[PDB]
């Protein structure tokens, strides 16, 4: 069903499926460790609901069984959040746009133990996107790739064929922007190599959330708990 689509049809399907940019609490009160992580946890909890609806609107995802859908989301949910974050932070150099009313820098991350390392990695990825002039049509392809790829080897042939389709879509976007044959496969490679760091950031971030759960009180959502327990 997803394989019959053109590259243009693939783009339009992903763009229209884009989740909304949510907001944080509007209290403008110097953050503390618990208060900052609380806002992020609350924000991440609400974003997951829209991610799931986004995932089902990603071409080929409904063709997967319920359990296979669960696995892919459980493995990639933080990567998908982070790539969303760095994409929103793209036009804000040296800052992280978690929410439109929640724009943070690494100085604020210093008040949370170990947050700076992850902050610096996110800021580095964002500035990399900005240097590459990452377009929105490329972004939605990359994020879709993460969803279908990250958990594909910890179980599928249907997924690989959809992954091939997204690749065709990426090349089609680059050829549309007037890139040469050489510049196309070079940019394609550059984009996909960043997915390795997103994985790394997610893994390092997953440990942090695990230790935060053991330290009790930044109350984790029981949805987040199930997503976290999967790792």
């Amino acid at each position: 069903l997803a394989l019959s689509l053109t590259a243009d049809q693939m783009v339009s399907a992903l763009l229209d499926a884009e989740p909304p940019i949510l907001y944080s609490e509007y209290d403008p009160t110097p953050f503390s460790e618990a208060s900052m992580m609380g806002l992020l946890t609350n924000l991440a909890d609400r974003e997951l609901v829209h991610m799931i609806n986004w995932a089902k609107r990603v071409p080929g995802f409904v063709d997967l069984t319920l359990h296979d859908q669960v696995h892919l989301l459980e493995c990639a949910w933080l990567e998908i959040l982070m790539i969303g974050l760095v994409w929103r932070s793209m036009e804000h150099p040296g800052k992280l746009l978690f929410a439109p009313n929640l724009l943070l820098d690494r100085n604020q991350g210093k008040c949370v133990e170990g947050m700076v390392e992850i902050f610096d990695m996110l800021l580095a990825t964002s500035s990399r996107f900005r240097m590459m002039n990452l377009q929105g049509e490329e972004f939605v392809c990359l994020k879709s790739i993460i969803l279908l790829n990250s958990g594909v080897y910890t179980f599928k042939d249907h997924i690989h064929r959809v992954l091939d389709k997204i690749t065709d879509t990426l090349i089609h976007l680059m050829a549309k922007a007037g890139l040469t044959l050489q510049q196309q496969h070079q940019r394609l490679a550059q984009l996909l190599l960043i997915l390795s760091h997103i994985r790394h950031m997610s893994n390092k971030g997953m440990e942090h959330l695990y230790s935060m759960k053991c330290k009790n009180v930044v109350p984790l959502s029981d949805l987040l708990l199930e997503m976290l327990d999967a790792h």
Binding site: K56, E74, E226, M227
Partner: peptide, 9 residues
């Protein structure tokens, strides 16, 4: 799982 319900709704 809560994830099961959300994926079905």
């Amino acid at each position: 799982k809560i994830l099961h319900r959300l994926l079905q709704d």
